[PDB]
């Protein structure tokens, strides 16, 4: 929670630069908001009701409260393939981050259903083809019937 790269792929060590966070490798965002599990002392918000977001997620039975909870990690396909494959299951309920301008993140007091929201990933590329930092990601939507 102390580091600014919480719930992000990478390393605990992180330095702030003009291109973002050094320790931030890959992030998954719902509605362009990073999916993070409520933790620390900044998750005391309860929202419109008296139930905290973490307690609401626990009551809903969603153990996938964040990227770290799911255990999602990147693993190479082979010894020298150079292609990394990682996966996780989309939860029915997620806790929206109220603001990303503070560490640890301050989470909203109520959860919302992920259906209809657009799920977007962002892989931070330290060296592009010309050998510099280029931000690339993909987009998808959480369908519902």
């Amino acid at each position: 929670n102390s580091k600014a790269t919480d719930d992000a792929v990478g390393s605990a060590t992180t330095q702030s630069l003009s291109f973002g966070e050094l320790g931030r490798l890959l992030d998954v965002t719902f509605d362009d908001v990073i999916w993070s599990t409520p933790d620390g002392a900044n998750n005391t918000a309860t929202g419109n009701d008296s139930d905290t977001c973490s307690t609401e997620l626990s009551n809903a039975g969603i153990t996938d409260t964040g990227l770290g909870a799911t255990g999602f990690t990147l693993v190479e396909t082979g010894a020298a393939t150079g292609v990394f494959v990682g996966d996780f299951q989309i939860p029915s309920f997620w806790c929206r981050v109220s603001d990303t301008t503070t560490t640890p993140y301050t989470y909203a007091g109520d959860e919302e259903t992920t259906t209809g929201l657009d799920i977007e990933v962002n892989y931070v590329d330290f060296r592009d083809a010309s050998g510099e930092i280029v931000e690339v990601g993909d987009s998808a939507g959480v369908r519902a019937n």
Binding site: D31, G116, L117, D118, E120, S139, A140, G141
Partner: protein, 125 residues
């Protein structure tokens, strides 16, 4: 164009400007900055959400049911309560509105501040 009481109306809005994200079903009427105002000649609902039919269609669809008023014996058996008169609902599908037997529906949409596009309907037997 013409409705009776205890009837449901499907509200459709073609607003390509509000299709903010192609992979996200956009919504309107949620906040006070972008309000949706449904109203009769005496009753109204505030902050009524509307939902896009598709992820990248640009058309918003939602329905409200006119619950009428409970002060009438429509069945003629001699007791009130024929229609559960109640004004409630804020989502795109659970809107409930009370409406007199002689009233008029009004739906107003805002696309920019101090600018509003409105729709009208009438209620008869």
């Amino acid at each position: 164009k013409v409705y009776s009481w205890t009837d449901k109306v499907y509200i459709t809005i073609v607003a390509p400007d509000h299709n903010f994200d192609s992979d996200l079903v956009d919504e309107i009427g949620e906040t006070d900055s972008d309000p949706i105002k449904v109203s009769t000649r005496g009753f109204d609902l505030d902050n009524y959400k509307l939902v896009e039919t598709g992820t990248d269609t640009g058309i918003f669809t939602g329905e409200v049911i006119l619950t009428g008023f409970t002060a009438h014996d429509a069945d003629g058996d001699g007791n009130t309560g024929d229609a559960t008169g109640t004004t409630s609902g804020s989502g795109p599908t659970d809107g409930l509105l009370a409406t007199d037997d002689d009233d008029g529906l009004t739906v107003s949409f805002e696309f920019s501040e101090d600018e509003t596009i409105v729709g009208s309907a009438l209620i008869r037997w």
